[PDB]
Amino acid sequence: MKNIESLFDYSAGQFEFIDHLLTMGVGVHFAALIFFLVVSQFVAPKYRIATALSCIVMVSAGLILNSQAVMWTDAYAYVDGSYQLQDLTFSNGYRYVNWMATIPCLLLQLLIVLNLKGKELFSTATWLILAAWGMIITGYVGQLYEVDDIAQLMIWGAVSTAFFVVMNWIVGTKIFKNRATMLGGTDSTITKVFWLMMFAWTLYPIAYLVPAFMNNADGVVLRQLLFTIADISSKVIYGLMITYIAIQQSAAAGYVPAQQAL
Ligand SMILES: CCCCCCCC/C=C\CCCCCCCC(=O)OC[C@H](O)CO
Ligand SMILES: *C\C=C(C)/C=C/C=C(C)/C=C/C1=C(C)CCCC1(C)C
Ligand SMILES: CCCCCCCC/C=C\CCCCCCCC(=O)O
Numbered sequence: 001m002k003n004i005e006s007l008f009d010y011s012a013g014q015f016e017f018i019d020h021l022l023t024m025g026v027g028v029h030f031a032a033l034i035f036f037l038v039v040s041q042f043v044a045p046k047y048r049i050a051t052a053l054s055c056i057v058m059v060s061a062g063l064i065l066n067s068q069a070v071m072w073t074d075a076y077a078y079v080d081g082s083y084q085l086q087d088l089t090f091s092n093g094y095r096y097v098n099w100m101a102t103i104p105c106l107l108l109q110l111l112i113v114l115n116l117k118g119k120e121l122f123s124t125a126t127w128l129i130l131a132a133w134g135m136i137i138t139g140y141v142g143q144l145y146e147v148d149d150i151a152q153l154m155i156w157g158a159v160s161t162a163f164f165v166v167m168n169w170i171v172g173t174k175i176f177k178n179r180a181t182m183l184g185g186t187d188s189t190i191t192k193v194f195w196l197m198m199f200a201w202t203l204y205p206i207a208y209l210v211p212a213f214m215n216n217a218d219g220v221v222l223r224q225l226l227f228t229i230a231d232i233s234s235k236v237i238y239g240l241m242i243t244y245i246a247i248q249q250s251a252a253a254g255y256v257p258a259q260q261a262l
């Protein structure tokens, strides 16, 4: 009721496209899960947790996308030529709470493949997770006002973006201070991962602002389209690059199953 999805009736095409986006996302994530599961054996024990975190991200994101898809079809019914709201079951907030768990996993596999260890990994991970949670919690409170108070959404978004900026500065600083430790030529691959993150993660605040510049049923479709692109890029494609780095460093470090896989 606090989100814009509940304000509109949807044509069969709008509704079915949203449903097909969420279901396609479920399919992509669970198919990648199998990939990450099977290739974890070609990863040296030092990096194997990284690929394991990808499996957790796939299932976590897949289950929430599957949840959203069923709530979507539970909330609406085709009545008099359009899908109209019938039950209070759909909300984007479930995406936000899920990020509390998936964003730490995404950040953690990055630090693992960067060769961080001991105190620094623990210290760096704690500040990154605290910043990320501050970003998500303020963003969560913000989207509660995307219908009733768009000014408050913009102010909470401003506070959330500050955490986002500080979070990226820590990530970027550690990447560029530690890329020289990376093996198998992955010191150049990790730089591409940082820019993939910058691009993919920034699509979320854009989707967050849709209610402010496209408050209509088409904006609801656009937001889900942006979520779908960001999810696939920040979770799947990102995970593939992390796994490639984990495997390439494993081989350069003398892990035979990795060398045999490459
Ligand atoms: C909400 C209104 C406030 C808006 C605020 C806008 C200011 C953006 C500033 C920084 C963004 C850059 C994010 C971090 C990018 C990487 C940082 C970096 O590269 O520094 C590392 C250095 O190279 C050592 O290795
Ligand atoms: C599924 C993976 C990730 C990394 C999800 C990331 C979400 C964000 C980076 C959200 C950022 C926000 C900002 C920067 C300001 C508006 C509120 C948001 C929470 C959407
Ligand atoms: C190698 C095996 C690859 C893994 C294949 C993954 C299988 C995914 C199967 C279909 C996704 C299920 C989602 C169905 C719920 C849709 C909800 C609805 O809109 O009614």
Ligand SMILES: CCCCCCCC/C=C\CCCCCCCC(=O)O
Binding pocket: 045, 046, 047, 048, 049, 108, 112, 121, 122, 125, 126, 129, 130
């Ligand atoms: C209050 C917020 C606290 C957040 C703390 C986060 C805790 C996680 C810190 C890093 C530990 C990562 C565990 C994986 C270690 C991998 C070692 C290995 O590969 O053998």
Ligand SMILES: [Cl-]
Binding pocket: 060, 061, 064, 095, 098, 099, 102
């Ligand atoms: Cl997620």
